[PDB]
Amino acid sequence: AGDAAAGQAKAAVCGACHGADGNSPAPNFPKLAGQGERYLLKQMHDIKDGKRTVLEMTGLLTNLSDQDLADIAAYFASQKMSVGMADPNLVAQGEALFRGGKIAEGMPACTGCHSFPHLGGQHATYVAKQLTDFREGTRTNDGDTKIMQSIAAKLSNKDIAAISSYIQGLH
Ligand code: HEC
Ligand code: HEC
Numbered sequence: 001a002g003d004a005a006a007g008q009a010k011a012a013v014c015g016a017c018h019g020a021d022g023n024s025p026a027p028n029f030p031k032l033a034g035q036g037e038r039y040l041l042k043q044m045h046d047i048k049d050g051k052r053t054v055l056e057m058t059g060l061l062t063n064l065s066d067q068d069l070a071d072i073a074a075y076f077a078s079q080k081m082s083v084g085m086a087d088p089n090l091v092a093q094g095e096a097l098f099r100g101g102k103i104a105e106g107m108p109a110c111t112g113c114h115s116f117p118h119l120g121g122q123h124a125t126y127v128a129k130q131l132t133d134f135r136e137g138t139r140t141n142d143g144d145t146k147i148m149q150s151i152a153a154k155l156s157n158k159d160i161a162a163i164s165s166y167i168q169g170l171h
Pocket of ligand 1: 030054057
């Protein structure tokens with residue numbers, strides 16, 4: 001159990017890339033605001049011990065205690081993710097995939113598990129990178145099941161671009 005109030009100051013070093021409140025202004029860096037505390041904490045441990053490699057964060061988590069990480073996670077989880085706009089040329093394809101999946105190819109809809117990390121409002125650039133990394137097996141911290149890797153295997157590049165654009169505007 002983290003202390004959100006204590007996490008705010010401990011999160012100051014993170015704001016340079018993720019935003020003071022976790023709402024990053026630049027699309028390369030993911031928004032952390034409003035993300036689930038348990039998801040955030042798991043990603044922090046995965047990044048810290050190398051199960052998920054984020055070279056841009058090398059050395060930042062090294063000296064944070066497990067309590068420090070829980071406080072920071074609690075702080076970001078207490079914020080609210082800001083919501084962007086979808087591209088009108090892509091949003092229909094992206095929303096149809098998000099709500100309906102690809103029934104023909106046995107791909108479940110995203111709404112089954114993602115309303116679990118929060119997705120709605122996340123930068124499209126960041127989401128597309130994660131879906132592509134999942135598909136290519138470069139991100140592998142999705143458990144022994146490899147659910148996201150198996151799901152992203154069914155998405156084309158056009159699918160990923162459209163779903164990512166839809167998610168960016170989702171609220
Ligand atoms: C830029 C120099 C960063 C600073 C300072 C911090 N983070 Fe970071 N973080 C950065 C990038 C480029 C990425 C994404 C890499 C990729 O997969 O494309 C991240 C990612 C995270 C995550 C994962 C978020 C998710 O949605 O899965 C977390 C939990 C995270 N970062 C936490 C975190 C904390 C706690 C920081 C302060 C100590 C911090 N980051 C600083 C870049 C940068
Ligand atoms: C349940 C079986 C899921 C379905 C169906 C989909 N996703 Fe998923 N996703 C799931 C989990 C359990 C996780 C967390 C993995 C971890 O590293 O612990 C994820 C993760 C994502 C992410 C990364 C989020 C982040 O902040 O980096 C994205 C972008 C994502 N999932 C997207 C996504 C889409 C577009 C889906 C439908 C096509 C979808 N997921 C299905 C669980 C499940």
